[PDB]
Amino acid sequence: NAIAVVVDKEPITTYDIDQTMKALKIDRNKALGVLINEKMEISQMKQLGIVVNDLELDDAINKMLAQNKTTLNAFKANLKSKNQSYEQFRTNFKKDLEKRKLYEKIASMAKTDFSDDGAKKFFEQNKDKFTFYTQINANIYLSNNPQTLENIKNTKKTILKPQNASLNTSNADPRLLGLLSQIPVGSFSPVLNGKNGYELYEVKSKDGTQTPEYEQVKNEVLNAYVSEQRQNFIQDYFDKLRSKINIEYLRA
Amino acid sequence: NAIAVVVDKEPITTYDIDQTMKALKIDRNKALGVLINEKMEISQMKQLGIVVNDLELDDAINKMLAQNKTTLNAFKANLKSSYEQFRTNFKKDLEKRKLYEKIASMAKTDFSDDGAKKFFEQNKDKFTFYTQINANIYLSNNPQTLENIKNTKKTILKPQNASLNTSNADPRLLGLLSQIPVGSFSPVLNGKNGYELYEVKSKDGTQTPEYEQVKNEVLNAYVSEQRQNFIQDYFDKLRSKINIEYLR
């Protein structure tokens, strides 16, 4: 209808704000915030030469199909029932990929610390994110066949009977405690190597000191430390950008 | 407290029954059933000549310690949370394993591919196949180091990451590895002694396996099922043959 905001030089119309207010449960200045950030991304996409082919797009579609254990035809039938169009799907999927290429590119610009002391210090600063329970009770399922336990982590229907372990600090190895403490009440662990054969744990309850401990978590802190460095650099990159660009509201 | 039931001359007491109801949170009749089974096994160890002498016991422990690259003393301190308890339980676990191997050996198990194929048909979804599998490989000229990596999971040290597929790998390795959960280890294998494989990625090409792709896996599952069904039936029969007295 009329132009409400120009970002760099890219216009944002009252129509955009309107149609965007609809797309979410949000609204200007929320719809306005989204639109402002979308224009920043599009402009960075141009400057960094971000682009997605039809072949990249199609290749990405297939990979999503496999990851979801489906097929194009089946995925296309499901969509039909959603009364949603394949063509729309492709369009929206493409934009997600462009955005993903953009954030990959941006993150490739950063200098990441992978040092042991870097991580430790990150640990000491964020111990809360690594709290393990001291007492965990769960249903354990056992089998010689790991695929029969897999069919339970996916298919929640099963035989035969689970045991009910009360994993005390001395009832079992603390790595597993750390593992299950993540898993939410009700949900399954991965299928694990066990003494006799394979094991699957369905947590029933989690209590305990919430105790922490490094070296027993070395691998988790490093991923989180690195994840956070990525997130911050990306954020920082856009803060600095939100500062350097002209955002003008119009008499609209 | 007081003797409630006698199984082939092994007594089960109120204290045992009330205390087993505790460690398992099950009812009187279900606790009884557990202790009865325990006494049945003890009775069978006598009939089947099952015994673990101190010599064999000390050897099994030493070899357990050798594997984990540890030592009696180190292992004794690590236990601070008893050693004699550990020993007697280690012994009982071993007596039990020998018991079940002897019983399983009385089954006339079918080891034929003919039988395994019939099992396969009725159990297809219990086996999978991926044409692409990414795995950490740990090679050692020593079976013990590898076995400890599997149990401990502590690097010792750096594995070769391999992207295995149908051009690259024996179809028996892919059949094997296809069953292993991402994150989990294969058994220790020899090419020779030996190789351990650590599964990082599959799917990577899911497919319905042909019997021939997964036959070792199928065959092992088929043998295990026959053995467990024989052992289970063996104790159900014994349940109504062995001499049991209840109070009153």
| Residue ranges per structural domain of chain B | 1-128+207-248, 129-206
Distance CA A246, CA A241 (A): 10
Say if CB A225 and CB A126 are below 8 A apart. no
CB within 8 A of A9, min separation 6: which ones? none
Distance CA A219, CA B42 (A): 45
The angle that helices B171-179 and B211-239 make with each other, rounded to 10 degrees, is: 50
Using a CB-CB distance cutoff of 8 angstroms, which residues of chain A are in contact with residue B206? 66, 69
Q: Check A193 against B179: CB less than 8 A apart.
A: no
CATH number 3.30.470.10 is the correct assignment for the domain at B1-128+207-248: no
CATH topology of domain A132-209: Chitinase A; domain 3 (3.10.50)
Helix (H, G, I), strand (E, B) or coil at B200: strand
Resolution of this PDB entry, in A? 2.3
CATH number 1.10.4030.10 is the correct assignment for the domain at A1-131+210-252: yes
Distance CA A243, CA B128 (A): 54
Query: What are the Cα distances from residue B74, in Å, to B55, B79, B82, B83, B85?
Result: 22, 9, 13, 11, 16
Q: Check B224 against A190: CB less than 8 A apart.
A: no
Distance CA A152, CA A125 (A): 38
Distance CA A214, CA A229 (A): 20
Structure tokens at A199: 């094991």
DSSP A141-204: EEES-HHHHHHHHHS----SPPEEEEE-TTTS-HHHHHHHHHS-TTPBPPPEE-SSSEEEEEEE
Residue with tokens 């003919």: B114
Distance CA B88, CA A187 (A): 36
CA-nearest residue of chain A to B217? A145
Q: Check A191 against B179: CB less than 8 A apart.
A: no
Q: Check B220 against A175: CB less than 8 A apart.
A: no
Distance CA A45, CA A54 (A): 17
Report the residue from A66, A145, A150 with minimal CB separation from B221: A145
CB within 8 A of A25, min separation 6: which ones? none
Say if CB A146 and CB B180 are below 8 A apart. yes
Distance CA A136, CA A208 (A): 8
Query: What are the Cα distances from residue A49, in Å, to A11, A111, A147, A219?
Result: 21, 21, 45, 35
What is the distance, to the nearest Å, from the Cα of residue A48 to the centroid of all Cα atoms in its chain?
24
Pairing of strands A3-7, A10-13: antiparallel
CA-nearest residue of chain B to A172? B81
Torsion sign, CA atoms A88, A91, A96, A97: positive
Q: Starting from the edge strand earliest in sequence, which strands make up the sheet with B132-139, in order?
A: B160-165, B132-139, B195-202
Question: Residue A206 — φ and ψ, nearest 5°?
Answer: -140, 115
Using a CB-CB distance cutoff of 8 angstroms, which residues of chain A are in contact with residue B218? none
Strands of chain B, DSSP E? 3-7, 10-13, 129-130, 132-139, 160-165, 195-202, 206-207, 244-246
Residue with tokens 């199928």: B218
CA-nearest residue of chain A to B198? A193
Question: Residue B123 — φ and ψ, nearest 5°?
Answer: -145, 30
Kindly state whether B25 is in contact with chain A, defined as any CB-CB distance less than 8 angstroms: yes
Distance CA B195, CA B188 (A): 6
Most B CBs within 10 Å: which of A167, A182, A193, A220, as the mutation test of the B interface? A193
Q: What experimental approach yielded this model? A: X-ray
Residue type, A86: Y
Q: Check B81 against A190: CB less than 8 A apart.
A: no
Using a CB-CB distance cutoff of 8 angstroms, which residues of chain A are in contact with residue B203? 66-67
The whole-angstrom distance between A134's CA and the closest CA on chain B is 14
Q: Check B181 against A69: CB less than 8 A apart.
A: no
CA-nearest residue of chain B to A67? B203
Residue type, A186: G
Distance CA A43, CA A12 (A): 13
CATH topology of domain B129-206: Chitinase A; domain 3 (3.10.50)
Most A CBs within 10 Å: which of B67, B96, B125, B131, as the mutation test of the A interface? B125
Give the count of alpha carbons within 13 A of A204, CB side only: 10
CA-nearest residue of chain A to B81? A170
The whole-angstrom distance between A67's CA and the closest CA on chain B is 7
Structure tokens at A1: 């209808």
Kindly state whether A155 is in contact with chain B, defined as any CB-CB distance less than 8 angstroms: no
